Design a binder for this molecule. Structure first.
Ligand code: HEC
Length: 104
């Protein structure tokens, strides 16, 4: 998973709604710091849909690969408006970026 390639994918597809920094700002979407190994819907100070709050999985590589491929299929009724990233490589690249960025 190429971190630098993941950076650019994040900017293109994710940055309009999400920050990755520790104590970063909530926007349209929750700040993503400390994402890995946390349950869905647990970012402090963000109002989630009941669907995201009660999804009840743990974020990791496996779960992110499935989610980012098709958000609304994984979490029906999410308010995250994003169609998905179809390609495996692109997703692994992005997830590599997040593993690092959301843990610094
Ligand atoms: C790159 C394609 C993106 C990644 C990676 C993520 N998003 Fe989003 N996102 C948005 C909202 C409003 C929410 C909350 C929606 C709801 O509660 O139904 C989300 C949710 C996520 C989550 C889960 C958060 C949790 O802690 O459980 C992850 C991991 C996530 N998103 C990653 C908004 C948007 C958005 C605005 C239109 C875009 C372009 C994206 N999200 C894209 C990405």
């Amino acid at each position: 998973g190429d971190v630098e390639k993941g950076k650019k994918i994040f900017v293109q597809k994710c940055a309009q709604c999400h920050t990755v920094e520790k104590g970063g700002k909530h926007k349209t979407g929750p700040n993503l710091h400390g994402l890995f190994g946390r349950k869905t819907g647990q970012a402090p100070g963000f109002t989630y849909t009941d669907a995201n709050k009660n999804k009840g999985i743990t974020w990791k590589e496996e779960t992110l690969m499935e989610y980012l491929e098709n958000p609304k299929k994984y979490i029906p009724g999410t308010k995250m408006i994003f169609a998905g990233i179809k390609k495996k490589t692109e997703r692994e690249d992005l997830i590599a970026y997040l593993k690092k960025a959301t843990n610094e």
